[PDB]
């Protein structure tokens, strides 16, 4: 081969994505991403609060007990955020040749800058939500444990300094570099 442009699928329990070469990194990432640029814009921080309020109202219109409304809104918001951000790997439209085929949106936010104000806000929101919501199901221990597990294992662990570009081959042999 005179170019050697191949994608590897090495198999290991814990693995990381390789650093990009000069051609892939310095040259193929020059134009705006158009996928994570919208995060820092006008009115892009109140939408989360609006969504939470609308979800709470919608779940309250059914007429359930106070505990179940809060549990349902917590779980649905966290699951939706995880599905939108931390699940898909790639971009919905060709960028240059497929340079962003191994990074999620959370890893594409702010051009791979670890600690930015928007990331701090997006990590602070779940903690405040849990602290507000837990006052309504303190008596029941099972609901407390389930909500704590959902908040920590899904809404906090993926957002860490560690577990960045981290891959596990249990659900499938992933493609790194």
């Amino acid at each position: 081969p005179v170019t050697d442009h191949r994608r590897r699928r090495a198999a290991a329990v814990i693995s990381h994505v390789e650093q990009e070469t000069f051609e892939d990194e310095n040259d193929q990432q020059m134009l705006p991403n158009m996928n994570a640029t919208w995060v820092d814009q006008r009115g892009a921080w109140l939408i989360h609060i609006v969504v939470i309020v609308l979800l709470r109202l919608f779940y309250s219109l059914f007429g359930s007990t106070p505990k179940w409304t809060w549990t349902l809104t917590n779980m649905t918001y966290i699951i939706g955020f995880y599905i939108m951000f931390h699940l898909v790997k790639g971009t919905p439209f060709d960028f240059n040749g497929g340079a962003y085929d191994n990074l999620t949106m959370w890893e594409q936010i702010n051009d791979e800058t670890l600690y930015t104000p928007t990331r701090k806000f997006l990590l602070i929101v779940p903690i405040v939500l849990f602290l507000i919501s837990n006052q309504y199901y303190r008596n029941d221990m099972t609901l407390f444990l389930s909500n704590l597990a959902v908040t920590v294992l899904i809404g906090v662990v993926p957002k860490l300094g560690i577990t960045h570009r981290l891959r596990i081959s249990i659900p499938g042999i992933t493609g790194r570099a």
Binding site: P1, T3, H5, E25, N26, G98, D111, I127, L148
Partner: protein, 500 residues
């Protein structure tokens, strides 16, 4: 107790994350530690850049511009009057053998009348992009006519032929794909391969064993890898080579692509309008069907059809994808109307009668037989063109080149590769320039002594990636008479013998 402690634990970590590092960056490929501001300005003031363009070798390489012929107030035809060296030398009534137009059907009266009517009723400028009120309901007619004439499902137009291949191939390939291409493709194909960003392999020029072995090894490796999905694969070649002039064995390629599940991409710039009983293309030559034999076909309208532009042929899905996935199609203006109408009229005329193709084939065969069976030129030059080709290519024997200039093709190729790899500012090679000067001297001698104009292969060695050598080219067209061509062949042979 237990409940209170958990709440405090989450709160405490939120403060630490808020008071994190000062926006830690990403580890790039270059970095330098901190140093005092005061000594930074010394580095800024000590920087010395290079000139935008190197003027050192301009004077020695400037003889190419002064030798370019210029036509004086008449269309390019068989007999022209030319001036050279800023009107310093002038020649009148010069026989021409350096025109790419073969059929010469675009100079007839009906085409001129159609062009005049289209100009009167439509204008000269398209004035709009492809998607913003650009189509002038003649582009659709031309597309339908091309699709019906060439026996396919659809065709897409392009403003320029040189920017057709580098715009369609990258749209269907990305990283992780496999492309197998011949080692004699032209410059636009090389640019398309470079912009494709995919794995590229090379096999020997017209050798089926190498292609079969490469395909077998790749298929075995892919089967062993057990990939979740099947990547896209392609085979790249062309009908008649622009630098050599040979032909492609279509049946073997079809059999191999059917056996190993590949796809075929073919450039037909020099084959459309010259091969086949009527002129359909390469498929008619071997008595096959273009619908199944070839998957992607690229053609140009300027060589023989007589108007600027190009086209890409295929099925409905590919054209629909190209409508939005081609950079050249989306971000460029539409083609004018008179060219479209003239091309449609030429297609109708070619469908009506097929005498020009027969005359062109007879002339090409006669020229090849004249320059193929001469024994006095055996020790000096060789012919590297197929008998069915309409352009004759002549090269020098390796023994003569080694005797005179003392260099070989492999050494030149490796020297150029090393210079390109090291990224040198100045790239000058002496024996190549000497050989080019010798060929230009031959051409000038022929033109001065016998009033016959022939061309020389104009290439830029810096942009080339594959081996190539200078050569001479002779063209033909259907409008000439056999007597003049017969006289010109002997004249060129005499000039070649006299120069050597």
């Amino acid at each position: 107790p237990y409940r209170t402690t958990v709440e405090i634990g989450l709160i405490l970590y939120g403060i630490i994350y808020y008071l994190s590092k000062p926006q830690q960056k990403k580890s790039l490929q270059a970095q330098k530690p901190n140093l005092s501001p005061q000594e930074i300005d010394a580095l800024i003031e000590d920087w010395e850049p290079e000139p935008l363009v190197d003027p050192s070798a301009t004077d020695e390489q400037s003889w190419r511009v002064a030798k370019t012929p210029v036509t004086m107030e008449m269309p390019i035809q068989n007999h022209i009057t030319i001036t050279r060296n800023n009107l310093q030398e002038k020649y009148t009534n010069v026989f021409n053998l350096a025109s790419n137009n073969f059929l010469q059907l675009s100079a007839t009266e009906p085409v001129k009348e159609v062009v005049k009517t289209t100009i009167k009723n439509y204008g000269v400028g398209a004035c709009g992009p492809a998607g913003f009120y650009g189509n002038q309901d003649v582009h659709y007619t031309l597309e339908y006519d091309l699709a019906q004439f060439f026996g396919t499902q659809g065709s897409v137009l392009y403003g320029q032929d040189f920017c057709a291949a580098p715009s369609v191939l990258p749209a269907f390939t990305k990283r992780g794909d496999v492309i197998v291409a011949d080692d004699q493709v032209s410059l636009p194909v090389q640019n398309a391969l470079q912009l494709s960003r995919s794995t590229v392999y090379y096999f020997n020029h017209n050798d089926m064993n190498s292609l079969e072995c490469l395909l077998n090894e790749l298929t075995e490796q892919e089967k062993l890898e057990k990939l979740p999905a099947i990547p896209r694969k392609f085979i790249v070649t062309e009908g008649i080579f622009h630098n050599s002039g040979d032909l492609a064995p279509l049946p073997e390629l079809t059999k191999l692509k059917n056996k190993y599940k590949f796809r075929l991409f073919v450039d037909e710039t020099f084959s459309i309008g010259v091969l086949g009983a009527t002129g359909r293309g390469l498929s008619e030559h071997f008595n096959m069907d273009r619908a199944t034999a070839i998957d992607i076909t690229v053609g140009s309208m300027a060589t023989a059809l007589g108007s600027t532009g190009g086209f890409v042929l295929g099925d409905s899905v590919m054209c629909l994808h190209q409508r939005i996935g081609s950079n050249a199609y989306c971000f460029s203006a539409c083609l004018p109307a008179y060219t479209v109408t003239s091309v449609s009229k030429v297609l109708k005329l070619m469908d009506s009668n097929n005498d020009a193709v027969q005359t062109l084939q007879k002339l090409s065969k006669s020229l090849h037989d004249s320059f193929a069976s001469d024994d006095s030129l055996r020790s000096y030059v060789i012919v590297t063109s197929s008998p069915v080709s309409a352009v004759l290519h002549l090269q020098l024997t390796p023994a003569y080149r080694s005797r005179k200039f003392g260099y070989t093709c492999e050494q030149l190729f490796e020297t150029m590769s090393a210079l390109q790899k090291k990224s040198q500012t100045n790239k000058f090679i002496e024996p190549y320039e000497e050989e080019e000067k010798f060929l230009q001297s031959i051409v000038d001698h022929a033109l001065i002594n016998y009033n016959v104009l022939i061309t020389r292969n104009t290439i830029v060695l810096k942009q080339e990636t594959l081996p190539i050598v200078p050569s001479l080219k002779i063209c033909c067209n259907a409008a000439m008479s056999p007597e003049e061509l017969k006289n010109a062949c002997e004249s060129v042979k005499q000039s070649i013998l006299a120069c050597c």
